[PDB]
Design a protein around this ligand. Structure first.
Ligand SMILES: *[C@@H]1O[C@H](CO)[C@@H](O[C@@H]2O[C@H](CO)[C@@H](O[C@@H]3O[C@H](CO[C@H]4O[C@H](CO)[C@@H](O)[C@H](O[C@H]5O[C@H](CO)[C@@H](O)[C@H](O)[C@@H]5O[C@H]5O[C@H](CO)[C@@H](O)[C@H](O)[C@@H]5O)[C@@H]4O)[C@@H](O)[C@H](O[C@H]4O[C@H](CO)[C@@H](O)[C@H](O)[C@@H]4O[C@H]4O[C@H](CO)[C@@H](O)[C@H](O)[C@@H]4O)[C@@H]3O)[C@H](O)[C@H]2NC(C)=O)[C@H](O)[C@H]1NC(C)=O
Ligand SMILES: C[C@]12CN(C(=O)OCc3ccc(OC(F)(F)F)cc3)C[C@@H]1CN(C(=O)c1ccc(S(N)(=O)=O)cc1)C2
Ligand SMILES: [Ca+2]
Ligand SMILES: [Cl-]
Ligand SMILES: [K+]
Ligand code: NA
Ligand SMILES: [Zn+2]
Length: 805
């Protein structure tokens, strides 16, 4: 109930919300059915439109007008945005040359440059180039300020998950808004685009920027605008707020546009109808900048122009139907569209089985345009699993397609030509970032980055301490002229041991054998030096990784590789090796096929054993440093040490062997040498974070050898590929992956073919940031380079995407 009989007199777009049944005058009262009776009349004036004309100049203040052209309007803070242009012979902001803003130029009483976030729904990254002729204001912001060629949204690339990720710095799995539509089984409640449940605070986790600001004494404009408030009015309201007295004036503001998304859905991302929405957004940017200029704020405010996601061509006819795969289609609930999420229609039905639903959906049709996953098997880069609102069964839908339950769902609901929501690596899903103002750099292009990073930067812009989030604070320092955040490297928590030779061969009873009993003073000081770290500068190029948790581990040196060997997990946490352009690939000699050798530096009690692998009929083993890349027949024996062994399903060994035999050398050839760090990952609770030992769900049968959920590799080289990886004077180039360690290759539909037809495709799908690996392992990489730490942070957030131009 609202007693809608109070009044908005002098309260129009009030900043503090009043509590029902008292009537509201804030920019959200409409959405709650709570506005006072006179809200439209007082607060939503439209008379005479949005612009001054020659004949309105110096008019007598008529309070009924939408905006004003009277002499007193500047001091009132309510002129039309083109007032000075029409009536005072001023130029529009867009017509002025750009001039570097070296320092904030702010009216007296401003304690900090205000921040204005101008968010545009569905603004695909290529609109910047393709619509440039019709967006002169946006283009000026872009070329004069700091811009990225695109910004990566989060998955799913829908509006709510992305705007709330912008506001919090969190992955959807952590902030809780995991789609535009959700069921939370704990609440037994559903979240929908339409309706009232979405307003309940229990959906919205983390701490969004407006709450972070308020808690730390920085006042915020109210971020959300009711759909019926026209754009012109939103701008005028922001401009009016900026005229409040110092003690009342917010420092941070948000504008949101439903365009171009609204039209993109109807006409497709490049429909001829899309030009007008782009012109109209540009005109709105023009109104804001002209309005700031009138208030002498155009060289004081930092403006961020940011999108939530792009838009792809998608039509009704490109829909896959679950009714073409499943017999039991009525026993499931599907969240449909550009992603799929499946659960049982009824929790009382004990005949529901996810294993058989997944199998019925797996590689069933030659050109199948979706792929089913258990959520924990989704690419780790999507960070889309650790939330009870995310159903166990997920369908990743190919770009340009939909998934629906039954045909009736599509024609009893072609309307649309655009949609979005797909995998956040998809080119058409990328969106925009421009920063313009005193605190951003001048005429600077920065590489693409992810929208989870922006919260930290928005906090830096406002002098706020960010709540804990998934950005990597300092990774976007290169966007900023000042207010940079200068982090220190995390402290190493565990120091390694450096074991020498301590065990005799006969102390080991591991059930392992090797054909290695064949017998030199010249070459015997040589082997000793190698085991003491003589070649370590070659193979460990960026320092050893730091272990950021409490554990017991040994550094092990070898001719061709160095490893940090965990006495707790019985295998390396990391193995580091460098492969030059010139390196040669050899085979595993016949006599050494099943060779595993005790490591006399490491106790039998802290070693794996071959008997466990023999007994475990499902599980085989692989090696972290690849025997194929040994530098000499003699060095090859090191690759067969029990301390280089890791557990691997036979199906996974197909993947791993092709990576090690073919791909590593291919990259070294293409990149002029590579440094590789590989290792296991254990993430049994799929939270993106390193497991402790007591979280491990699977061991090699009859042993304490834990089975990894994933294997990573970090592959580093010189960005200037004229220099070899091991003699690089400047910036680095990296690509990484986190491959799922699975007992089958059901994910790859072409896996009965030769590994040259499917393995690299699988690896590309599981591309990762070094930072993703850092979370999953508790390791910190690149500790010793000649590069600045912020540069290294940017490198650690880099994702190699494998999309074309
Ligand atoms: C991305 O960045 C984010 C933010 O930094 C990272 O997420 C953090 O990770 C931490 C480790 O997982 C986690 O710390 C835990 O906090 C628990 C208290 O949680 C509440 O308080 C915070 C602070 O305000 C709040 O943010 C939380 O909000 C969550 O939950 C509500 C709903 O309940 C949601 O509205 C909200 O969206 C958010 O949900 C997300 O996180 C939760 C986990 O908290 C997930 O379950 C959800 O799926 C969702 O993803 C909370 O309101 C605290 O209780 C934990 O302490 C336990 O573990 C420690 C280990 O140190 C142990 O010693 C303690 O005893 C305790 O164990 C006890 O409880 C266990 C479980 O019941 C039980 O098994 C034991 O026996 C014990 O009884 C823990 O410290 C932190 O909460 C989140 N923060 C956020 C916002 O998500 C994230 O990791 C980053 N991602 C990556 C890949 O890097
Ligand atoms: C919620 C809302 C955005 N809103 C609003 O005023 O937002 C202000 C804001 C600005 C910046 C923020 O973050 C920051 F500053 F950090 F960048 C956060 C919020 C009103 C719109 C209603 N909405 C929809 O109806 C809607 C629209 C489209 C889709 S779809 N089909 O997925 O495209 C789905 C739903 C979206
Ligand atoms: Ca984990
Ligand atoms: Cl959704
Ligand atoms: K076996
Ligand atoms: Na297969
Ligand atoms: Zn949309």
């Amino acid at each position: 109930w609202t007693a809608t009989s109070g009044s908005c007199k002098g309260r129009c777009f009030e900043l503090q919300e009043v509590g029902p049944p008292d009537c509201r005058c804030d920019n959200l009262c409409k959405s709650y059915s709570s506005c006072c009776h006179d809200f439209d009349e007082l607060c939503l004036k439209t008379a005479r439109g949005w612009e001054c004309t020659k004949d309105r100049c110096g008019e007598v203040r008529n309070e009924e007008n939408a905006c004003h052209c009277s002499e007193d309007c500047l001091s009132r803070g309510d002129c039309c945005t083109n007032y000075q242009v029409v009536c005072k012979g001023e130029s529009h902001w867009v017509d002025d040359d750009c001039e570097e803003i070296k320092v904030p130029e702010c009216p007296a009483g401003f304690v900090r440059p205000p921040l204005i976030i101008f968010s545009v729904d569905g603004f695909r990254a290529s609109y910047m180039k393709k619509g440039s002729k019709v967006m002169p204001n946006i283009e000026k912001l872009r070329s004069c300020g700091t811009h990225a060629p695109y910004m990566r949204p989060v998955y799913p690339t829908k509006t709510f998950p992305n705007l709330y990720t912008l506001a919090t710095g969190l992955y959807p799995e952590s902030h809780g808004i995991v789609g535009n539509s959700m069921y939370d089984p704990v609440f037994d409640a559903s979240f929908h685009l339409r309706g009232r449940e979405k307003f309940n605070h229990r959906w919205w986790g983390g701490q969004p920027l407006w709450i972070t600001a308020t808690k730390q004494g920085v006042r915020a404009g109210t971020f959300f605008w009711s759909v019926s408030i026209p754009h012109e009015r939103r701008i005028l309201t922001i401009l009016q707020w900026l005229s409040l007295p110092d003690n009342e004036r917010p420092s941070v503001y948000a504008f949101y546009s439903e365009q171009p998304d609204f039209s993109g859905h109807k006409y497709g991302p490049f429909g001829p109808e899309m030009t007008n929405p782009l012109r109209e957004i540009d005109k709105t940017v023009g109104q804001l900048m002209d309005g700031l200029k009138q208030l002498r704020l155009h060289r004081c405010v930092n403006v961020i122009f940011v999108g939530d996601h792009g838009m792809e061509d998608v039509t009704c006819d490109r829909t896959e139907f679950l009714s073409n795969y499943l017999t039991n289609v009525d026993d499931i609930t599907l969240v449909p569209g550009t992603l799929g999420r499946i659960r049982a229609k009824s929790i009382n039905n004990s005949k529901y089985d996810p294993k058989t639903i997944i199998a019925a959906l797996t590689c069933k049709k030659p050109d199948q345009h979706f792929k089913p996953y258990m959520k924990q098997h989704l690419p780790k880069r999507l960070h889309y699993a650790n939330n009870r609102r995310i159903e166990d069964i997920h369908l990743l839908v190919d770009r340009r397609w939909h998934v629906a339950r039954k045909p009736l769902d599509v024609y009893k609901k072609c309307f649309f030509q655009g949609d979005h929501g797909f995998d956040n690596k998809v080119n058409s899903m990328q969106t925009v970032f421009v920063g313009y103002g005193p605190t951003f750099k001048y005429r600077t292009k920065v590489p693409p980055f992810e929208n989870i990073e922006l919260y930290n930067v928005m906090c830096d812009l406002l002098g706020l301490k960010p709540a804990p989030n998934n950005g990597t604070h300092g990774s976007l320092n290169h966007l900023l002229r000042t207010n940079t955040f200068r982090p220190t490297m995390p402290d190493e928590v565990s120091r390694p041991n450096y074991p020498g030779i301590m065990y005799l061969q006969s102390e080991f009873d591991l059930g392992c054998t090797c054909d290695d009993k064949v017998e030199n003073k010249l070459e015997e000081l040589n082997k000793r030096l190698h085991t003491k770290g003589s070649t370590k500068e070659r193979h460990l190029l960026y320092g050893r990784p730091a272990v950021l948790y409490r554990t017991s581990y040994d550094i092990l040196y070898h001719t061709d590789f160095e490893s940090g060997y965990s006495e707790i997990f019985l295998m390396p946490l990391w193995t580091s090796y460098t492969i030059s352009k010139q390196a040669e690939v050899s085979s595993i000699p016949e006599h050494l096929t099943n060779c595993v050798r005790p490591d006399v530096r490491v106790s039998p009690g802290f070693s794996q054993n071959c008997l466990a692998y023999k007994n475990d009929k499902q599980m085989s083993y692989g090696f972290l440093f690849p025997p194929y890349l040994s530098s000499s027949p003699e060095a090859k024996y090191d690759a067969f040490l029990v301390t280089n062994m890791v557990p691997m399903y036979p199906a996974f060994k197909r993947v791993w062997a092709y990576f090690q035999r073919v791909l590593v050398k291919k990259y070294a050839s293409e990149r002029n040498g590579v440094n590789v760090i590989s290792g296991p990952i254990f993430d049994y609770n799929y939270d993106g974070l390193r497991d402790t030992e007591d979280e491990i769900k699977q061991y090699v049968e009859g042993s304490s050898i834990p089975v990894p959920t994933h294997y990573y590799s970090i592959i580093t080289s010189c960005l200037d590929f004229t220099q070899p990886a091991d003699k690089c004077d400047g910036p680095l180039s990296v690509s990484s992956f986190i491959l799922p360690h699975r007992p089958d290759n059901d994910e790859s539909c072409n896996s009965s073919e030769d590994e040259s037809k499917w393995v690299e495709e699988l690896m590309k799908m599981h591309t990762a940031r070094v930072r993703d690996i850092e979370h999953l392992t508790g390791l910190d990489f690149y500790r010793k380079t000649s590069r600045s730490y912020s540069e290294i942070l940017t490198l650690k957030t880099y994702l190699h995407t494998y999309e074309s131009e």
